[PDB]
Design a protein around this ligand. Structure first.
Ligand SMILES: O=[N+]([O-])c1ccc2[nH]ccc2c1
Ligand SMILES: O=[N+]([O-])c1ccc2[nH]ccc2c1
Lengths: 12, 224, 224, 12
C-alpha cells in the first residue's frame, strides 16, 4: 500500500 | 463513422512528451539509458491516466488494475515508439527530440532490443497500421497481458472481449477488402510480447549494475 | 464436415512418444532434465516431418523452412504438453509415462516455467480447446514465428494467411455461438511466445552449466 | 550445411 502505481490509480 | 470504442480511445490518446536529454551532459551509454528511463518514468504516469479511459478498466479491483499495468506497461511503451517510427527508416522515435539510429543504438548497448522493435515497425509498415488500429491494439495489449495474479478472471475476459469486438467492428467497416485484417492485427501481439520481455530483462539488468539512476515509478514497474 | 486444412493437420498429427526415464538412474534434477531434453530431441525429429505436411511449407526455401522451425520449435513442444494436460489438474503430461506435478517441477528447478505452462493449460481449459483448434494453432505458431532471417517474406505471409483462414473457417462453422472465437484463439499466442522464450532461456543456461547431456538436434535448435 | 535440421528437412 506504499505503491506509487496504487497512489496514481486512486488519484482523481 | 466507425466504432465508438475506437473513437473514444483516439480522444483519450495522451499528448506527446519530450525526452529532453541534458545538453550539459556528455553523450554516453549512461546518458542515453538515463534519458530513456526518465522518459519511460514520465510516460508511465500518462499511461496510468490513459488506462482509466478504457471502458470497464476503472470497474476492476485496484488489485486487477495494478496487475494489468504491471504486465503490459512495457508493451504499451514499445507500441508508442513503434507507431511514432512508422514514417521513418531504420530509426526509432522515442520522442520528437530523441530519434535513435543503429549507431546510437550501438552506443547505448541497445542494438539487439532496437532491432526487434524495428522488426515490429517493419511488419506494421507493410500492414499500413492506422492510428485507430494502434490505439485499439494498445488497449488489447493491456487487457490481454496474462498477469498470473488476476482476481476477477471473468471481468478481465469481458474487457478483452469488448476491445476485441471493437477491433473486429472497426476492421469489418473500414477494411472490407481483407476480412482477416482483425486477426492479422492480433497476430502481431506475440512479437510485441517477445520484444517487451527482452526490454524488461535488459532494463532489469541495468537496474542491477546500479550505474543508471531510475525514478520511483519506473523502478516499481521493473520490480513487479 | 469442416475445413480441409484442419482435417489434413489432424491426420498429420504425429504418434505419442514415451519419455522412458532410465529406471536404473536415481531421481534427481539432472535425471529429470536429461529425460526432458532427450524427449525434446526425439519430438523435434517428429516435428520436422510434421511441418512438411503443412500446405505450402515444403515450397519455401530450405533456408526459410529452417528459420520458421528455429523460431517456433519450443512453442510447438509446449503446445503438445499443454494439449495432453487439458484433462489433468496442476500436472503437465510431457508423455504418458512422464507427468510432472508441482513437487516434481520443484525437484527439477522447473517450478516457474511449469507454472507458466499451467497458465496456458488453465486458459485453454476455460475455452474448451478442441484437437482441431490445437493442431491449427500449432501450424499458425510455426508460420507466425517472427524469425529475423526470412528470405521470402510474402510467401511466409501467404502461409500465415492460409492457416489463419482455416482457423476462421473452422470457427465460423463449428462455433456460431461465439463469432470472435478465432480471435480469442489467436489471443492465446502471446502467452505461448512468452512461455517459449522462458523455456529456451532456461534450457540454454542448463546447456552452459554443462551438467546435463543433450543430443545433436536439441543442441542445434537451442544454439539457433 | 553440416546442420542435422537441414539434413532431416532434405530427408525423403
Ligand atoms: O524498449 N524500451 O526499453 C523502451 C521502449 C519504449 C520507451 N519509451 C520511453 C522509454 C522507452 C524504453
Ligand atoms: O518447456 N520445456 O522446456 C519443454 C516443453 C515441452 C517438452 N516436450 C518434451 C520436452 C519438453 C520441454
Amino acid at each position: 500500500n506504499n505503491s506509487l502505481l496504487l497512489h496514481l490509480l486512486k488519484s482523481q | 463513422p466507425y466504432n465508438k470504442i475506437v473513437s473514444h480511445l483516439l480522444v483519450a490518446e495522451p499528448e506527446k512528451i519530450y525526452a529532453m536529454p541534458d545538453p550539459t551532459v556528455p553523450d554516453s551509454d549512461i546518458k542515453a539509458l538515463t534519458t530513456l528511463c526518465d522518459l519511460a518514468d514520465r510516460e508511465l504516469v500518462v499511461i496510468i491516466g490513459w488506462a482509466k479511459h478504457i471502458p470497464g478498466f476503472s470497474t476492476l479491483s485496484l488489485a486487477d488494475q495494478m496487475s494489468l499495468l504491471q504486465s503490459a506497461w512495457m508493451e504499451i511503451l514499445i507500441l508508442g515508439v513503434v507507431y511514432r517510427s512508422l514514417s521513418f527508416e531504420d530509426e526509432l522515435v522515442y520522442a520528437d527530440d530523441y530519434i535513435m539510429d543503429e549507431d546510437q543504438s550501438k552506443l547505448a548497448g541497445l542494438l539487439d532490443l532496437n532491432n526487434a522493435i524495428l522488426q515490429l515497425v517493419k511488419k506494421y509498415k507493410s500492414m499500413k497500421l492506422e492510428k485507430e488500429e494502434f490505439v485499439t491494439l494498445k488497449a488489447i495489449a493491456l487487457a490481454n497481458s496474462d498477469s498470473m495474479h488476476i482476481e476477477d478472471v471473468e471481468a478481465v475476459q469481458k474487457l478483452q472481449d469488448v476491445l476485441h469486438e471493437a477491433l473486429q467492428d472497426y476492421e469489418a467497416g473500414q477494411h472490407m477488402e481483407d476480412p482477416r485484417r482483425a486477426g492479422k492485427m492480433l497476430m502481431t501481439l506475440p512479437l510485441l510480447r517477445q520484444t517487451s520481455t527482452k526490454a524488461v530483462q535488459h532494463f532489469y539488468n541495468i537496474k542491477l549494475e546500479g550505474k543508471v539512476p531510475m525514478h520511483k515509478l519506473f523502478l516499481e514497474m521493473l520490480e513487479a
